[PDB]
Amino acid sequence: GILDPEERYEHQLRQLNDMGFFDFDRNVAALRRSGGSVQGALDSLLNG
Amino acid sequence: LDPEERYEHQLRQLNDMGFFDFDRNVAALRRSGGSVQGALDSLLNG
Amino acid sequence: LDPEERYEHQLRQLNDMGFFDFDRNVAALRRSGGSVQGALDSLLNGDV
Amino acid sequence: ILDPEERYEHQLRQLNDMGFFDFDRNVAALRRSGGSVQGALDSLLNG
Amino acid sequence: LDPEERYEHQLRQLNDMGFFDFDRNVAALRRSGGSVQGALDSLLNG
Amino acid sequence: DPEERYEHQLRQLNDMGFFDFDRNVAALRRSGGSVQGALDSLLNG
Amino acid sequence: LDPEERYEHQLRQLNDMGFFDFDRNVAALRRSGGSVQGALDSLLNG
Amino acid sequence: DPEERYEHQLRQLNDMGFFDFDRNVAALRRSGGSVQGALDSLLNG
Amino acid sequence: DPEERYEHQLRQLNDMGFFDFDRNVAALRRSGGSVQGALDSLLNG
Amino acid sequence: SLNIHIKSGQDKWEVNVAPESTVLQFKEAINKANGIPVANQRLIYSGKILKDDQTVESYHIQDGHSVHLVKSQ
């Protein structure tokens, strides 16, 4: 079962969505690259 | 912990807005980490 | 079997230190064999 | 396969764990010692 | 077709055994036809 | 160049415990490259 | 310049037929003018 | 030195099946080195 | 020693098809070593 | 007083050292608790070979850090 992106990045997905970043596939993509860092994925999301 | 219990407040809002499909709603909500705002946007395109 | 998964723990630390550039980080990390300590040094001299 | 970072991964790590951060130097040293950390170390400590 | 590449596995063994001198090692190995066993003996007199 | 020329013979000799290069080349030149022959040479002179 | 070099291909044939004695071989070959065929015959009677 | 002196001739003779060294040198000395002549000699004694 | 003494001449004679040693030496001794002369001798006895 | 990790192969050993003990003391101290004789221990921290007549703290070896041990000779 271990694991599953929605479950794994729950807390982060929430913050991103809280900031207007609604695109799941983009968010997961960004977050995997930042190792789970919201701070990092944010930066990624703001430049593609 | 349990989806119906976990997303109660949100499921309600979605259903109020006419989004009656449970499976879709839970799917949407898991993806948005529980954000109604986000799941709405998701539901409105797939 | 896949950089984001392979260097997860390290990507996180780098991102937690403000090093947001994925391509650079993976490059630096491959070169240091996964050592954060080493990739950091690389990243700080554009030896990467 | 057939790619230095992949090929000398385990050694590169040990060198880096010892403070030897210069990639090009390490690969150079490792190629010469045939992969031996023990040998590359000695190389790196005199050129 | 290049000593470091050709004698890689042998060079490694020699080096773990403390035989750090590349030129000596290749010299010893060419003479032993690639045999570590042989190059060792050579290096210990050689 | 002897090491290159008698490479795979030198290997066999070395892989039988005959580590002396000069002796091996000497023996091999005499046997015209034959491992079989050089062996015999090495076992008496 | 030099028997081993001069009679290389012949020495090899002799050796691969079991005729291991270098001095005998060269002696035989010099007499047969290089002919393996001839030196063989010589070696089989002295 | 006969082997050295009659090298190219000894080879031809040997390559015609005339393996007896002493006979060949004997025949060649008599023919002044001529293979053609030593041949003829060898074919009648 | 005739083979050694008349080497160069024996060769020429053999080169011209005169293979009989005894005849050649006989002819040469009489001509004092002259090929030209022994030839003539050999062509009539 | 400092407390340092030591590494070889896939081995560890802990040792105690006063900040201003020599590197030679530091070597003895390892030895006393791991076998490898002093004259065989080559010690590497931060890209440097630790030399015998230097203070352990000259290398700024912090508490809880690993100093590597390459056995030699």
Side-chain angles (χ1 to χ4, degrees), chain A, chain B, chain C, chain D, chain E, chain F, chain G, chain H, chain I, chain J residues 1-9 11-73:
Chain A
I2 45 263
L3 202 6
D4 191 345
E6 296 95 320
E7 259 48 17
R8 185 211 219 87
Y9 302 121
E10 192 201 37
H11 285 140
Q12 300 93 329
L13 282 168
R14 219 242 217 263
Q15 293 175 70
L16 290 176
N17 273 263
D18 280 50
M19 281 167 134
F21 296 90
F22 305 138
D23 177 346
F24 175 72
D25 283 329
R26 267 182 129 250
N27 294 341
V28 179
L31 279 167
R32 279 191 60 241
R33 280 163 131 252
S34 71
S37 176
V38 175
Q39 165 142 298
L42 242 201
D43 182 72
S44 275
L45 287 161
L46 299 166
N47 350 275
Chain B
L1 99 83
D2 215 350
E4 293 95 323
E5 263 52 16
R6 186 212 220 88
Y7 301 119
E8 188 203 38
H9 131 263
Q10 300 94 325
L11 279 169
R12 217 232 214 268
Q13 290 182 71
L14 290 177
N15 275 265
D16 275 334
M17 280 169 140
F19 296 89
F20 304 137
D21 179 348
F22 177 75
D23 288 329
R24 266 186 129 247
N25 287 339
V26 178
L29 275 168
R30 285 191 56 244
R31 277 165 134 249
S32 73
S35 175
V36 178
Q37 172 135 291
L40 234 206
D41 180 75
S42 273
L43 288 161
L44 300 169
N45 354 271
Chain C
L1 211 179
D2 189 346
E4 294 91 320
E5 259 52 15
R6 189 211 220 88
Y7 298 119
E8 194 204 30
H9 298 290
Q10 300 94 327
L11 285 167
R12 221 240 215 259
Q13 288 179 69
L14 289 177
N15 274 261
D16 289 321
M17 280 164 127
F19 295 90
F20 304 139
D21 176 344
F22 177 75
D23 285 331
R24 268 184 127 248
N25 293 343
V26 176
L29 278 163
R30 281 188 60 242
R31 281 166 132 248
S32 79
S35 172
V36 174
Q37 161 145 295
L40 246 202
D41 188 71
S42 269
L43 288 164
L44 295 171
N45 342 271
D47 268 355
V48 181
Chain D
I1 42 201
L2 203 210
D3 190 347
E5 295 91 319
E6 260 51 12
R7 188 216 220 86
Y8 299 120
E9 190 202 35
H10 304 287
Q11 301 96 327
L12 280 171
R13 216 240 219 262
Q14 288 179 74
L15 290 172
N16 278 262
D17 278 346
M18 280 175 135
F20 295 88
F21 306 141
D22 177 342
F23 176 71
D24 283 326
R25 270 182 126 252
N26 293 338
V27 180
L30 277 165
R31 285 194 53 249
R32 278 159 133 259
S33 76
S36 168
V37 177
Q38 164 142 297
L41 240 203
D42 181 74
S43 271
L44 287 163
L45 273 348
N46 347 272
Chain E
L1 204 182
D2 187 347
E4 295 96 319
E5 261 52 14
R6 187 212 222 88
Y7 300 119
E8 191 204 32
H9 73 272
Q10 300 92 332
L11 280 169
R12 216 232 213 268
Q13 287 184 76
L14 292 176
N15 276 260
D16 281 278
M17 279 176 148
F19 295 91
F20 305 139
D21 178 343
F22 178 74
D23 287 325
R24 270 184 126 248
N25 295 339
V26 183
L29 280 165
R30 281 191 58 243
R31 282 168 131 247
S32 75
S35 169
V36 178
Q37 170 138 294
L40 242 203
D41 183 74
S42 276
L43 288 163
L44 296 165
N45 351 280
Chain F
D1 191 346
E3 296 97 320
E4 261 50 11
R5 185 212 224 88
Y6 297 122
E7 192 204 37
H8 88 320
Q9 301 94 329
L10 283 170
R11 219 233 212 270
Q12 290 181 71
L13 290 177
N14 275 263
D15 283 347
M16 279 171 133
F18 297 89
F19 306 139
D20 177 344
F21 178 70
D22 285 327
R23 268 183 127 251
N24 293 340
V25 182
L28 278 166
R29 285 191 56 247
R30 283 164 129 251
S31 74
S34 171
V35 178
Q36 170 138 294
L39 243 201
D40 184 75
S41 271
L42 288 164
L43 295 169
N44 351 273
Chain G
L1 216 101
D2 197 350
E4 295 96 317
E5 260 51 11
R6 187 215 219 86
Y7 298 123
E8 193 205 32
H9 74 251
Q10 301 92 331
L11 282 168
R12 215 233 213 273
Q13 288 181 71
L14 291 179
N15 272 264
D16 296 339
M17 284 167 129
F19 296 82
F20 304 143
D21 175 345
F22 175 70
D23 283 321
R24 268 182 127 255
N25 294 342
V26 184
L29 280 164
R30 282 196 54 248
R31 284 162 127 251
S32 77
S35 169
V36 176
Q37 168 139 296
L40 245 200
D41 182 72
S42 271
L43 290 160
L44 295 167
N45 350 277
Chain H
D1 190 350
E3 296 96 317
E4 259 53 10
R5 186 213 221 87
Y6 299 121
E7 195 203 31
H8 87 289
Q9 302 93 330
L10 280 170
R11 217 234 213 270
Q12 290 180 70
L13 289 176
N14 273 262
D15 293 320
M16 280 174 136
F18 297 91
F19 306 140
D20 179 345
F21 177 71
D22 286 326
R23 266 185 128 250
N24 292 337
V25 180
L28 280 164
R29 281 193 57 248
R30 278 164 132 250
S31 78
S34 167
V35 175
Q36 166 140 296
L39 243 202
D40 183 73
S41 270
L42 286 165
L43 298 167
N44 346 280
Chain I
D1 192 349
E3 296 94 314
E4 259 53 10
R5 186 213 219 87
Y6 299 121
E7 193 202 35
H8 199 273
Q9 300 94 323
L10 280 170
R11 217 235 215 269
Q12 291 178 71
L13 289 177
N14 275 266
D15 271 14
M16 288 169 121
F18 295 90
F19 303 141
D20 179 343
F21 178 71
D22 285 327
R23 268 185 126 250
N24 292 340
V25 182
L28 280 165
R29 280 192 55 252
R30 276 159 133 251
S31 73
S34 169
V35 178
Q36 168 140 294
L39 244 203
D40 182 74
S41 269
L42 288 162
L43 295 169
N44 350 276
Chain J
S1 170
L2 288 180
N3 204 308
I4 310 158
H5 292 76
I6 307 301
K7 288 177 174 164
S8 275
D11 282 327
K12 275 103 78 145
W13 300 273
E14 217 90 282
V15 354
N16 248 356
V17 209
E20 74 307 278
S21 269
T22 78
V23 160
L24 187 59
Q25 265 86 287
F26 179 31
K27 280 182 180 165
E28 281 153 354
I30 291 166
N31 165 271
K32 204 194 182 206
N34 95 326
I36 320 159
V38 175
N40 264 221
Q41 287 183 32
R42 157 190 306 194
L43 299 190
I44 289 160
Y45 184 82
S46 263
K48 295 132 96 50
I49 205 166
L50 301 197
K51 285 166 166 219
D52 282 4
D53 53 313
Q54 287 294 329
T55 47
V56 159
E57 84 153 73
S58 81
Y59 295 105
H60 305 119
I61 288 161
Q62 315 267 302
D63 213 2
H65 286 213
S66 298
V67 174
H68 288 64
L69 170 33
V70 181
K71 339 209 274 277
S72 322
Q73 285 210 336

